[PDB]
Amino acid sequence: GSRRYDSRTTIFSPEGRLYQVEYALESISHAGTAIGIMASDGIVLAAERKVTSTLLEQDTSTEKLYKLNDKIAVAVAGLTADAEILINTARIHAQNYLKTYNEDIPVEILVRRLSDIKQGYTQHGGLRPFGVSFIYAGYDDRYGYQLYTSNPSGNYTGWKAISVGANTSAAQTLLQMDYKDDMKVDDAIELALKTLSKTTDSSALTYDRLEFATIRKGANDGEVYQKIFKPQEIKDILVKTGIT
Amino acid sequence: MDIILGIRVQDSVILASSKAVTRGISVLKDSDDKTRQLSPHTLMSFAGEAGDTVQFAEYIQANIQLYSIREDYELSPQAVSSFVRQELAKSIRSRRPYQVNVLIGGYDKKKNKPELYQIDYLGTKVELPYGAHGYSGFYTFSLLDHHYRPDMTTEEGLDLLKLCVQELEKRMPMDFKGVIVKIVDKDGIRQVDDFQAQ
Amino acid sequence: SDPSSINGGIVVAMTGKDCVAIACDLRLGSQSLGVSNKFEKIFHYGHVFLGITGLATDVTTLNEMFRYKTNLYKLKEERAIEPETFTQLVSSSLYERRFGPYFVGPVVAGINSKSGKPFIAGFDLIGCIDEAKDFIVSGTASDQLFGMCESLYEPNLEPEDLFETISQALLNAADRDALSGWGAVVYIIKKDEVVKRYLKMRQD
Amino acid sequence: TSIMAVTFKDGVILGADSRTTTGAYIANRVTDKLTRVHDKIWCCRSGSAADTQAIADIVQYHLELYTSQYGTPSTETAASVFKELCYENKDNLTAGIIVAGYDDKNKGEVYTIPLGGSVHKLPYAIAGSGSTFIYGYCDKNFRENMSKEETVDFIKHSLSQAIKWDGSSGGVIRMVVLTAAGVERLIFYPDEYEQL
Amino acid sequence: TTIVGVKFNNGVVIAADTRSTQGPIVADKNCAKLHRISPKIWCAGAGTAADTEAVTQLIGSNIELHSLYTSREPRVVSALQMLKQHLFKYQGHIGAYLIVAGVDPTGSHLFSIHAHGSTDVGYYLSLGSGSLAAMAVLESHWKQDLTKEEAIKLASDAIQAGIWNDLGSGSNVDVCVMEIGKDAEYLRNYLTPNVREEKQKSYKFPRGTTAVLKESIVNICD
Amino acid sequence: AGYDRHITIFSPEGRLYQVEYAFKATNQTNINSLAVRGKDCTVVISQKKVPDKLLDPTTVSYIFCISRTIGMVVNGPIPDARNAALRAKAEAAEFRYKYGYDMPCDVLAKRMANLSQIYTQRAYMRPLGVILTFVSVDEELGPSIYKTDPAGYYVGYKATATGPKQQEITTNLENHFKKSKIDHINEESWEKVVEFAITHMIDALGTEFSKNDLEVGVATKDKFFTLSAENIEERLVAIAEQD
Amino acid sequence: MTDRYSFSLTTFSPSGKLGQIDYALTAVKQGVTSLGIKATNGVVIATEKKSSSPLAMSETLSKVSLLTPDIGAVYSGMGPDYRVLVDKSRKVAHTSYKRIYGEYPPTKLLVSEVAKIMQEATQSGGVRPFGVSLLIAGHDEFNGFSLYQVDPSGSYFPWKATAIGKGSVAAKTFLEKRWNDELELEDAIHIALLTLKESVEGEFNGDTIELAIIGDENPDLLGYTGIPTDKGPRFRKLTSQEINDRLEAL
Amino acid sequence: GTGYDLSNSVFSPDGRNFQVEYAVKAVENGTTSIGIKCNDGVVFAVEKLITSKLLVPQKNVKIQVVDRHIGCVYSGLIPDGRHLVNRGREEAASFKKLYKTPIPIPAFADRLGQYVQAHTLYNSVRPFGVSTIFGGVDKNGAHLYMLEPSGSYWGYKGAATGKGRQSAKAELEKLVDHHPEGLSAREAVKQAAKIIYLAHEDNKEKDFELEISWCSLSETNGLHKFVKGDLLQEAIDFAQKEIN
Amino acid sequence: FRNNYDGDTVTFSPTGRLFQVEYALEAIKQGSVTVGLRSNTHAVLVALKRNADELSSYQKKIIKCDEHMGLSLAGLAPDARVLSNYLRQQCNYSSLVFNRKLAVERAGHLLCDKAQKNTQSYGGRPYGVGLLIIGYDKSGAHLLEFQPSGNVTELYGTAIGARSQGAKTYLERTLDTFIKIDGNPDELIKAGVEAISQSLRDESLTVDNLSIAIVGKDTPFTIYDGEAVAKYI
């Protein structure tokens, strides 16, 4: 009966790859580039909005950068609506952990959980996997500033600097060339935007085409702060770093 | 009920726990150790209903050990006590609630301080310099309110427990057969082999 | 025996001119036995304060539940919850447990960040809203609190005066209740700043 | 409560008092205890108001669905639906129900469904707490095949005795007359019926 | 608590007092007991107040949803049927005792609902600890075809009966008028015959009267 | 294969072929129906064809009494038709029981139209090969015609027709209404409204009917019912005089 | 019996496409034009009624729907899919929000509940995607006025103005040219009417065009008086007359 | 491309369910069976093929009783028929349980109708491979029905299905014409034997046994009963006599 | 034809055939022959048992269902183990609840309806075993033939399995004679062993190779194998 219409989403090719995983990654390679860079005193997340129109409300808009916790954020490349499904559960998880332990969830624990949810769609259930790659920027008092990445397979790895979405090989090369371990955050803002600016398929890199965030120790405090840059603030920093 | 006393001094947490196990009319044992090590710097003592007591402690111990291996990391005392509190708070509204009261004595390595947590079977948790469950507070709190200093060495803490235990052996109608006394500090968990003659 | 009387404790809140105050004792008891003098019964989530009296385990649980839900709320709404909304959230969370209720008396106090209006509210243990403008009392000396507030309270007090009123209302009510006292804390709450004062009181 | 149904020559009449009490208090002095589950199938309710309402509503739902699929149900069918609810939920209901109906094949029928859920077809039926006082009277005065006016009189006299002695009964006497002619609702006020 | 409902020629009125009690203690001296099920169907409740609030709002919500689905104004019979079936299911454990009144395309309606799920229809009704005071008024003075003005008087006087004579009731009178032509009118605190007299003395304290151990500023910002 | 043509998923032109094919099925009976509204009644006329002599003509019907107030005529295979009928009856009874008033015609239609929308969306359910025309004299809206199809669409009508020769009747009624400038038949008696229906059916289709070639349903305030062969004959006779 | 279709009907093809979502957008492409314009003191949403018979009564078929007193929706694509989305959106506004906080959801949150229902139809066992794009217009105290588009994928984006369906490339171009940050609601209504005229073949009037706004509170639409903090719905469908009144000013 | 016939609930492009049409083929391939309505009852008859002497005569009964007043007979896949009848039996019990009265034949027809229709809604089931003739007497008359694999059913004056359905129909039409005021249960019984005998020319290759039942108000008191002994033999004679 | 329509039991072929059912039917035809027959006083089963090697045992073909009923199989043995087990329960239920021996005819109806459920639904397969059921009930002696199509037939005698047609002709010829062997258990069995011989092109029926069961008037269902069948070769 129903058998005939089943795509079999969770099977191996003869080469031992997962078709749906590879096809989903293909889909992700067409998405706005997202970059995350880690420094001693902070993390930068920068991302390109794919397609705009002058009628798009940039003030009310979020397609790339989402808060998980007061200490964790992600950049998204792929199917937005899929990412919201995951982001919402990741938010629930962070709170569960807080409720259980009275401590903010360590970054890895949150990243692993989400990646496990992703892996399941790969092995049982017969459902299409999530067409999403995440960069996670976070901070906890075990490992300090951490950057991770996870893709539709539910594999995740950690990074000093990373890109997802379009052109990641170009982006990765540039990053590998100019990244230095002692880099300070302000440097990283520059690097991240220079890299996006060189790798785009857009004619140039204007403020209306970016989302941007930092996780810093807040300068003046003694504790951690997430700044999701308002459209004006992006315009400012694009000039400060000389891309006007 | 059993005797479950804790005191947190300058550098350590001391737990003292009675040795008797009575089933109705006979003392079946005079050397029972009412304690489970949860993690190398975290100790939990317990009293309450007969099987629930050890079932609960051992269940807690399993979970913390699981976390320790998963994370390759030792949860903070405060984290462990919250976990335990949540478990007991679940249990109070379940079909058959664990009737178990616990003290959790931990040395927090990140903060470099000892911490003592009192949690009854309702999941009523409080952090305290000293505590007890059941009737033990009624005989010992007044001595502890008197002599207690937050600056005490481990050795002063023991003499103060000694006194507490003597007030118990004078005025409490049950023979609880003495206490096993354990210290939790920066170096982990050790048993005072002599409180019989110390 | 009565889950609302095992642990002891009181909370009162009051409105004045462009402020609210919320107070509680610090006692946690095990019936006759005083157990801790550091058990704060007031909590805040952004600018909204919640006091909770009753069974202490439920006090603790509820605070953790409300932290959890207000966190998620801010993440989606992109703004801090207001008192009126929070009050509805307390109400429907309590009622969800209608036949296995949390044994608590909650009190909500705060200032609506947009309207500037001072707001207080109370519930019974299954979530009925006491919507009144002047004062809300809860806990084991609430008979006494009602007595104190009714005489002592007048409308539109300046913060510094509201402070004396709420402290005196609390302290003297607590001193006529066996299960309350052993410390007290008072929050004076304005649109821009929140002050917390610990009170000196008798320790029997 | 004092309720009754009586078959006569041209069909069946249901009657009832109108008092519902909670203890000594008359919660409602003008209750309608004559409830319609179909055009010409009615019932009289006694026992818990909550239970008998819930039952009559479910019966009216079942018979509206019957009608859509199979046309007009027999009175016996109505009785049987009532009974299924009453018997199968005996532990949780306190419903004493009399069912009365008019059919062209069968003419007037009366079924009594007392507390446990048993069914009994009868020429007439009395029930409710007021009923105990009119067993004698009713057994003496009921005859088969009366006319409309005789039947109305028998009910009127019967219920008024029941009302006279039962504190739980009172107010107005209501009747529903069920025949080939249609459906007639009667009401009789204390000032008339106390005079009998 | 005293709640009445009174039918008049072109509509229905409900009213209620405003005292809320916990045992012998007045918890609220002016709570609103008149509840809106939809714009023109309103509700007064006695019994467990979490329950009357909760049941009123659940049904209200389902009513709103029904209305949207059917493109019709809500009916009092629908509020009634949903309320009663819900209460019946919970076997009197939801402690809701309600007078429910309104107008809708078919006319004007008055009903009562009891915890266990039974309903009544009437031209005048009362519920609550004041039921009997109130009812002495409606039995004495209710008549066929009251004007709006006479109905408000009657309702209002029935609540007063309970305010003055029932310890369970006091403070003010709230009315709501639902007339077939018009918008429902809610008249919160229509009568306030219980203003507390001026106190004999002021209890404002000299500042510094209260002994303070420790002060500190609380952190509300991010 | 052409899998998108077997279950209700989108073709690359964004079509649902299974839904289109279900519309085809609605014509397999080769019966036409029409519905019109009176001043205070609603009339549905449907052709009755009984090919086989071995049949009991009294049991061949596409008109259903859904509730006291609501009637429904179906264009489509009888078994799908009866599946729709039994459901609508169940829905109309439950609505009444849950909310204390009779289900309105428009709302029944919306409900059955929603059930259909689901067959359009879940793979495991096929659409039904039927078009449903619901009629009543609704207590709020007066005389009503609401028609639902295998796509889950429905709307209200001044009058409407359905079946293979739908269009002929359709254009005939459009012409009538362009002239009369109002949105109903202006007759006080249902009798006349049935007469108008049959007349315009005869003119649109180019055929005469005996009393056995039609089937008729009438909604009035608080009743919907169907006409006997004899009731219809009286009506055929009437149209024949004066004409 | 029993849905034994518990695998995805939308999956990834070698190039990364999700065919069913693409095909759903195609269905939307052929839908009748609909548009939204946001002004400083309101939002207007509009579309053509494209009645399928003059024997139909076109006012018994709204394409513009209230979701809450302050939020309304319009669509392009499959009407029956829209209708059930509306049912589910009204409901979710109550179960996920009104029954929890005692107020209606802000626009973006409702939109995100609609979007999720749509996302799930893209991944759950045995269903197809909804063949519609919604425009949802609303107001709430803390966000002001807004306009959101939601597509078959479940993606949503905020707009100052936009069009979807049949003639949307031209209409969006017309709107980019006429939109500015200073428009008042009557101005937007006017633009909407002009933009619509471009896509509409036949008669253009208050009977063949459907238009709603999210504007001021209309207390005269509340149904009761005496609670001063309830001023009534901000959503209002314009009437046939109100629309014609504005085509003289055309 | 096609294949519209591989799967049960699929509409062909002209709107047909091929699987149902193929289920009809299994029916057409079955033994002939018939029903005749008389003026107070109904008579059922069926051809049973004697594959061999080894079949115990009289013992493999094909006609089935439902409740106390309904007879059904069918051609096609015999087990399908039984399954239909098991359902009918549940369906009548339930009706009687709830409503006390025995199920009216029209009511009963629809119960089978809905169930058989149900089996054209999904691809996880197959349609019934039978046509069922059935009926009996109720509170207002005799009723005779036939129900196809699509779930289509109507009331009949006489009905026939299986291998010999054309002769049977033609015979049945003759009766309806040559007896316009009715036929009696007695006449119907004989007339049934005759028609089954005539029907048996298309299966001329094998021997057969005749099986008859009836339900008549006057002759069986509205209860379904198998025609046994003397009446069966008389009926056989009539058909034998009238074959020449 | 065949090709596209034999993929599952839920699909008709265009001529109205059920191919998975016919394929299951086909597993019977390649089973080892077995014969049933009965008089008015007894019923007899005889089956030819197949080994696998000359090192293996001969696989059993007769299963007892109750004191008065039992059967033989040809086709998939585990399918027989399922169906006879069900029959065991049906018999048992009847005794436990009604204190009544299950009629051999009801047994056939129950088997038919169990088989049928596996020919109309998705994911099932038909049974692929054929069955001969003998019994002695309140109406005397009975033999039934079950086919996994669900067709159950009551007969005087029959055979199923490879080359069963021999026995089936033999019995069809012997009919008037074997039906009369009343009160002579040994004669009827000898009549059955003759029938079964009509189906050996094969070889020769031997003592670890023949299996016979019998049930009748004062005889509980009983099975003979080995030295216990010697007197019949």
mmCIF file of N, CA and C in Angstrom, chain F residues 31-98:
data_model
loop_
_atom_site.group_PDB
_atom_site.id
_atom_site.type_symbol
_atom_site.label_atom_id
_atom_site.label_comp_id
_atom_site.label_asym_id
_atom_site.label_seq_id
_atom_site.Cartn_x
_atom_site.Cartn_y
_atom_site.Cartn_z
ATOM 1 N N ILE F 31 -26.710 12.820 -13.748
ATOM 2 C CA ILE F 31 -27.877 13.428 -13.117
ATOM 3 C C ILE F 31 -27.529 14.890 -12.964
ATOM 4 N N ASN F 32 -28.487 15.766 -13.246
ATOM 5 C CA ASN F 32 -28.331 17.183 -12.985
ATOM 6 C C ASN F 32 -29.300 17.584 -11.905
ATOM 7 N N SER F 33 -28.863 18.557 -11.112
ATOM 8 C CA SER F 33 -29.658 19.109 -10.043
ATOM 9 C C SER F 33 -29.581 20.649 -10.069
ATOM 10 N N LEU F 34 -30.579 21.293 -9.483
ATOM 11 C CA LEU F 34 -30.502 22.737 -9.326
ATOM 12 C C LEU F 34 -31.205 23.114 -8.056
ATOM 13 N N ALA F 35 -30.777 24.225 -7.470
ATOM 14 C CA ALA F 35 -31.374 24.709 -6.257
ATOM 15 C C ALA F 35 -31.656 26.189 -6.423
ATOM 16 N N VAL F 36 -32.798 26.643 -5.900
ATOM 17 C CA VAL F 36 -33.163 28.054 -5.940
ATOM 18 C C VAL F 36 -33.762 28.428 -4.595
ATOM 19 N N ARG F 37 -33.756 29.723 -4.275
ATOM 20 C CA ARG F 37 -34.331 30.222 -3.033
ATOM 21 C C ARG F 37 -35.606 31.002 -3.268
ATOM 22 N N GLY F 38 -36.621 30.710 -2.460
ATOM 23 C CA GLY F 38 -37.852 31.465 -2.438
ATOM 24 C C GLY F 38 -37.759 32.670 -1.513
ATOM 25 N N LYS F 39 -38.918 33.251 -1.204
ATOM 26 C CA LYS F 39 -39.061 34.356 -0.264
ATOM 27 C C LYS F 39 -38.749 33.797 1.122
ATOM 28 N N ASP F 40 -39.328 32.632 1.425
ATOM 29 C CA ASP F 40 -39.076 31.952 2.684
ATOM 30 C C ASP F 40 -39.040 30.427 2.556
ATOM 31 N N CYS F 41 -38.412 29.915 1.500
ATOM 32 C CA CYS F 41 -38.257 28.478 1.316
ATOM 33 C C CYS F 41 -37.023 28.243 0.462
ATOM 34 N N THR F 42 -36.596 26.993 0.326
ATOM 35 C CA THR F 42 -35.491 26.695 -0.541
ATOM 36 C C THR F 42 -35.813 25.408 -1.240
ATOM 37 N N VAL F 43 -35.599 25.386 -2.557
ATOM 38 C CA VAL F 43 -35.974 24.263 -3.395
ATOM 39 C C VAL F 43 -34.785 23.603 -4.105
ATOM 40 N N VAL F 44 -34.711 22.278 -4.021
ATOM 41 C CA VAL F 44 -33.741 21.517 -4.788
ATOM 42 C C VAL F 44 -34.459 20.545 -5.658
ATOM 43 N N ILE F 45 -34.128 20.580 -6.946
ATOM 44 C CA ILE F 45 -34.635 19.622 -7.929
ATOM 45 C C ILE F 45 -33.490 18.788 -8.457
ATOM 46 N N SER F 46 -33.707 17.481 -8.546
ATOM 47 C CA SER F 46 -32.701 16.556 -9.063
ATOM 48 C C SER F 46 -33.365 15.576 -10.024
ATOM 49 N N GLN F 47 -32.695 15.245 -11.119
ATOM 50 C CA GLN F 47 -33.236 14.284 -12.069
ATOM 51 C C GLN F 47 -33.220 12.913 -11.436
ATOM 52 N N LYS F 48 -34.241 12.137 -11.706
ATOM 53 C CA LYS F 48 -34.280 10.786 -11.212
ATOM 54 C C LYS F 48 -34.300 9.885 -12.431
ATOM 55 N N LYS F 49 -33.312 9.009 -12.517
ATOM 56 C CA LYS F 49 -33.228 8.040 -13.599
ATOM 57 C C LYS F 49 -33.151 6.658 -12.991
ATOM 58 N N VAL F 50 -33.978 5.751 -13.494
ATOM 59 C CA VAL F 50 -33.973 4.376 -13.021
ATOM 60 C C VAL F 50 -33.813 3.441 -14.223
ATOM 61 N N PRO F 51 -32.563 3.175 -14.648
ATOM 62 C CA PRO F 51 -32.356 2.424 -15.897
ATOM 63 C C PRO F 51 -32.987 1.022 -15.836
ATOM 64 N N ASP F 52 -32.655 0.270 -14.789
ATOM 65 C CA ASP F 52 -33.075 -1.104 -14.565
ATOM 66 C C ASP F 52 -34.541 -1.231 -14.090
ATOM 67 N N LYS F 53 -35.289 -2.134 -14.728
ATOM 68 C CA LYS F 53 -36.650 -2.502 -14.321
ATOM 69 C C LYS F 53 -36.688 -3.341 -13.043
ATOM 70 N N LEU F 54 -35.579 -4.013 -12.723
ATOM 71 C CA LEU F 54 -35.490 -4.840 -11.503
ATOM 72 C C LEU F 54 -35.341 -4.028 -10.203
ATOM 73 N N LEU F 55 -35.028 -2.744 -10.348
ATOM 74 C CA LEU F 55 -34.928 -1.826 -9.220
ATOM 75 C C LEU F 55 -36.279 -1.458 -8.610
ATOM 76 N N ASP F 56 -36.218 -1.163 -7.311
ATOM 77 C CA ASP F 56 -37.285 -0.559 -6.550
ATOM 78 C C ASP F 56 -37.092 0.955 -6.637
ATOM 79 N N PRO F 57 -37.860 1.621 -7.518
ATOM 80 C CA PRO F 57 -37.670 3.066 -7.741
ATOM 81 C C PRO F 57 -37.753 3.899 -6.461
ATOM 82 N N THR F 58 -38.453 3.402 -5.437
ATOM 83 C CA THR F 58 -38.588 4.184 -4.194
ATOM 84 C C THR F 58 -37.269 4.323 -3.430
ATOM 85 N N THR F 59 -36.290 3.478 -3.745
ATOM 86 C CA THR F 59 -35.012 3.514 -3.047
ATOM 87 C C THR F 59 -33.893 4.209 -3.830
ATOM 88 N N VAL F 60 -34.178 4.703 -5.025
ATOM 89 C CA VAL F 60 -33.166 5.395 -5.783
ATOM 90 C C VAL F 60 -33.323 6.879 -5.524
ATOM 91 N N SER F 61 -32.367 7.449 -4.788
ATOM 92 C CA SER F 61 -32.456 8.849 -4.360
ATOM 93 C C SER F 61 -31.099 9.521 -4.150
ATOM 94 N N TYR F 62 -30.960 10.767 -4.583
ATOM 95 C CA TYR F 62 -29.741 11.514 -4.212
ATOM 96 C C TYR F 62 -30.044 12.711 -3.294
ATOM 97 N N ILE F 63 -31.212 12.680 -2.658
ATOM 98 C CA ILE F 63 -31.613 13.762 -1.777
ATOM 99 C C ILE F 63 -31.670 13.222 -0.365
ATOM 100 N N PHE F 64 -30.974 13.862 0.584
ATOM 101 C CA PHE F 64 -30.972 13.384 1.973
ATOM 102 C C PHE F 64 -31.499 14.398 2.955
ATOM 103 N N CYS F 65 -32.316 13.877 3.868
ATOM 104 C CA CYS F 65 -32.759 14.628 5.034
ATOM 105 C C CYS F 65 -31.653 14.607 6.126
ATOM 106 N N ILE F 66 -30.857 15.676 6.203
ATOM 107 C CA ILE F 66 -29.730 15.691 7.111
ATOM 108 C C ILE F 66 -30.164 15.923 8.549
ATOM 109 N N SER F 67 -31.054 16.878 8.754
ATOM 110 C CA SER F 67 -31.543 17.176 10.095
ATOM 111 C C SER F 67 -32.994 17.629 9.932
ATOM 112 N N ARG F 68 -33.708 17.917 10.999
ATOM 113 C CA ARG F 68 -35.030 18.527 10.847
ATOM 114 C C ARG F 68 -35.034 19.688 9.799
ATOM 115 N N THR F 69 -34.031 20.571 9.843
ATOM 116 C CA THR F 69 -33.994 21.782 9.001
ATOM 117 C C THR F 69 -33.146 21.640 7.706
ATOM 118 N N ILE F 70 -32.185 20.723 7.696
ATOM 119 C CA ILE F 70 -31.206 20.732 6.614
ATOM 120 C C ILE F 70 -31.383 19.551 5.687
ATOM 121 N N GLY F 71 -31.387 19.854 4.388
ATOM 122 C CA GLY F 71 -31.421 18.853 3.343
ATOM 123 C C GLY F 71 -30.172 18.945 2.494
ATOM 124 N N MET F 72 -29.868 17.835 1.834
ATOM 125 C CA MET F 72 -28.692 17.757 0.990
ATOM 126 C C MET F 72 -28.935 16.897 -0.236
ATOM 127 N N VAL F 73 -28.580 17.443 -1.383
ATOM 128 C CA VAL F 73 -28.597 16.671 -2.606
ATOM 129 C C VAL F 73 -27.129 16.481 -2.943
ATOM 130 N N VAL F 74 -26.792 15.298 -3.471
ATOM 131 C CA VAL F 74 -25.424 14.955 -3.864
ATOM 132 C C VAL F 74 -25.348 14.758 -5.379
ATOM 133 N N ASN F 75 -24.310 15.290 -6.036
ATOM 134 C CA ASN F 75 -23.932 14.833 -7.383
ATOM 135 C C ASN F 75 -22.671 13.990 -7.327
ATOM 136 N N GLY F 76 -22.820 12.670 -7.445
ATOM 137 C CA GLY F 76 -21.691 11.736 -7.397
ATOM 138 C C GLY F 76 -22.150 10.324 -7.106
ATOM 139 N N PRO F 77 -21.220 9.357 -7.199
ATOM 140 C CA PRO F 77 -21.506 7.944 -6.915
ATOM 141 C C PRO F 77 -22.213 7.734 -5.574
ATOM 142 N N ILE F 78 -23.198 6.841 -5.547
ATOM 143 C CA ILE F 78 -24.034 6.681 -4.363
ATOM 144 C C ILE F 78 -23.235 6.328 -3.108
ATOM 145 N N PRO F 79 -22.196 5.460 -3.226
ATOM 146 C CA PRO F 79 -21.568 5.080 -1.968
ATOM 147 C C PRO F 79 -20.803 6.285 -1.325
ATOM 148 N N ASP F 80 -20.055 7.058 -2.103
ATOM 149 C CA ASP F 80 -19.449 8.260 -1.544
ATOM 150 C C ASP F 80 -20.543 9.163 -0.983
ATOM 151 N N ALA F 81 -21.680 9.182 -1.654
ATOM 152 C CA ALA F 81 -22.752 10.111 -1.316
ATOM 153 C C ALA F 81 -23.278 9.803 0.048
ATOM 154 N N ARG F 82 -23.506 8.516 0.301
ATOM 155 C CA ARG F 82 -24.009 8.019 1.571
ATOM 156 C C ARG F 82 -22.992 8.135 2.716
ATOM 157 N N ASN F 83 -21.710 8.059 2.394
ATOM 158 C CA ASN F 83 -20.649 8.295 3.363
ATOM 159 C C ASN F 83 -20.736 9.764 3.828
ATOM 160 N N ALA F 84 -20.910 10.663 2.870
ATOM 161 C CA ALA F 84 -21.069 12.093 3.179
ATOM 162 C C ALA F 84 -22.328 12.361 4.017
ATOM 163 N N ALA F 85 -23.421 11.692 3.622
ATOM 164 C CA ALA F 85 -24.732 11.821 4.270
ATOM 165 C C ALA F 85 -24.672 11.431 5.731
ATOM 166 N N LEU F 86 -24.088 10.252 6.020
ATOM 167 C CA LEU F 86 -24.035 9.703 7.373
ATOM 168 C C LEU F 86 -23.201 10.605 8.279
ATOM 169 N N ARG F 87 -22.094 11.110 7.728
ATOM 170 C CA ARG F 87 -21.235 12.029 8.448
ATOM 171 C C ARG F 87 -21.966 13.346 8.779
ATOM 172 N N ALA F 88 -22.548 13.996 7.771
ATOM 173 C CA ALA F 88 -23.251 15.261 7.986
ATOM 174 C C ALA F 88 -24.378 15.107 9.050
ATOM 175 N N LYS F 89 -25.069 13.955 9.011
ATOM 176 C CA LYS F 89 -26.091 13.671 9.991
ATOM 177 C C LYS F 89 -25.477 13.606 11.399
ATOM 178 N N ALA F 90 -24.344 12.918 11.513
ATOM 179 C CA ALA F 90 -23.617 12.782 12.765
ATOM 180 C C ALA F 90 -23.118 14.154 13.251
ATOM 181 N N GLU F 91 -22.596 14.944 12.323
ATOM 182 C CA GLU F 91 -22.106 16.276 12.666
ATOM 183 C C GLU F 91 -23.267 17.173 13.131
ATOM 184 N N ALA F 92 -24.420 17.076 12.454
ATOM 185 C CA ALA F 92 -25.550 17.955 12.769
ATOM 186 C C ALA F 92 -26.152 17.638 14.127
ATOM 187 N N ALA F 93 -26.108 16.366 14.524
ATOM 188 C CA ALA F 93 -26.627 15.931 15.797
ATOM 189 C C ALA F 93 -25.664 16.320 16.930
ATOM 190 N N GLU F 94 -24.377 16.139 16.695
ATOM 191 C CA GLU F 94 -23.430 16.449 17.734
ATOM 192 C C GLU F 94 -23.387 17.976 17.970
ATOM 193 N N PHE F 95 -23.373 18.754 16.904
ATOM 194 C CA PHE F 95 -23.392 20.207 17.064
ATOM 195 C C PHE F 95 -24.548 20.612 17.977
ATOM 196 N N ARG F 96 -25.731 20.020 17.753
ATOM 197 C CA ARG F 96 -26.934 20.417 18.455
ATOM 198 C C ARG F 96 -26.789 20.088 19.922
ATOM 199 N N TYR F 97 -26.191 18.933 20.179
ATOM 200 C CA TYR F 97 -26.017 18.416 21.513
ATOM 201 C C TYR F 97 -24.943 19.210 22.286
ATOM 202 N N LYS F 98 -23.814 19.476 21.637
ATOM 203 C CA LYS F 98 -22.745 20.288 22.219
ATOM 204 C C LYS F 98 -23.105 21.753 22.444
#
